[PDB]
Structure 1
Amino acid sequence: SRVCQVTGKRPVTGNNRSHALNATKRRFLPNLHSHRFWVESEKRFVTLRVSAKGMRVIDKKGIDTVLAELRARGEKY
């Protein structure tokens, strides 16, 4: 499933509000990108499918800080 393994973001439903205001169900598919992150505390290329914003969150907190939140909620990487 196209759901960020960090921010938890996932395809949200919406509507294509045209000029004439014609409702039309749609969705906002998150900008996920399978990126290979390296951990200095494990020496491994932990690949995680996260969105654009999901990657920045890993920059501040840290790849080690993010993974720590994964193994906590059952997330396997």
Structure 2
Amino acid sequence: SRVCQVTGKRPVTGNNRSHALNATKRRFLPNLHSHRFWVESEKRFVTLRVSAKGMRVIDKKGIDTVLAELRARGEKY
């Protein structure tokens, strides 16, 4: 799925309001990217499907902290 691994951003739905207010169901999709993060504590690259906000969260916290959340929740990589 187009689900981020850190933030958990799955796709959501909304309307595509036109200038005449015609609502047609559309999807907002996360800015997902498969990025390869270096783990110095493991000395290896771990690939994740993270959004850009997921990347910013990993960069604010540590990659070890985010991987800890993944592992505690039940994620794989």
Scaled by the length of structure 2, the TM-score of the pair is 0.97
1:67: how far off? Answer: 0.1
1:76: how far off? Answer: 1.0
Aligned equivalents of 1:34 and 1:4: distance in 2? Answer: 10
Aligned equivalents of 1:42 and 1:54: distance in 2? Answer: 20
Aligned equivalents of 2:56 and 2:67: distance in 1? Answer: 14
Aligned equivalents of 2:42 and 2:70: distance in 1? Answer: 15
Provide, for residues 2-32 of structure 1, a one-character-per-residue CA deviation record: whole Å limited to 9, x for no partner. 1000000111000000000001000001100
Aligned residues: 77
Unpaired segments of 5 or more residues in structure 2? none
The answer for the alignment partner of 1:15 in structure 2 is 15
The answer for the alignment partner of 1:42 in structure 2 is 42
Q: Percent identity at matched positions?
A: 100
Aligned equivalents of 1:71 and 1:35: distance in 2? Answer: 18
Aligned equivalents of 2:60 and 2:53: distance in 1? Answer: 12
Unpaired segments of 5 or more residues in structure 1? none
The answer for the alignment partner of 1:25 in structure 2 is 25
1:60: how far off? Answer: 1.0
Q: What secondary structure does 1:21 align onto?
A: coil
Scaled by the length of structure 1, the TM-score of the pair is 0.97
Aligned equivalents of 2:28 and 2:45: distance in 1? Answer: 29
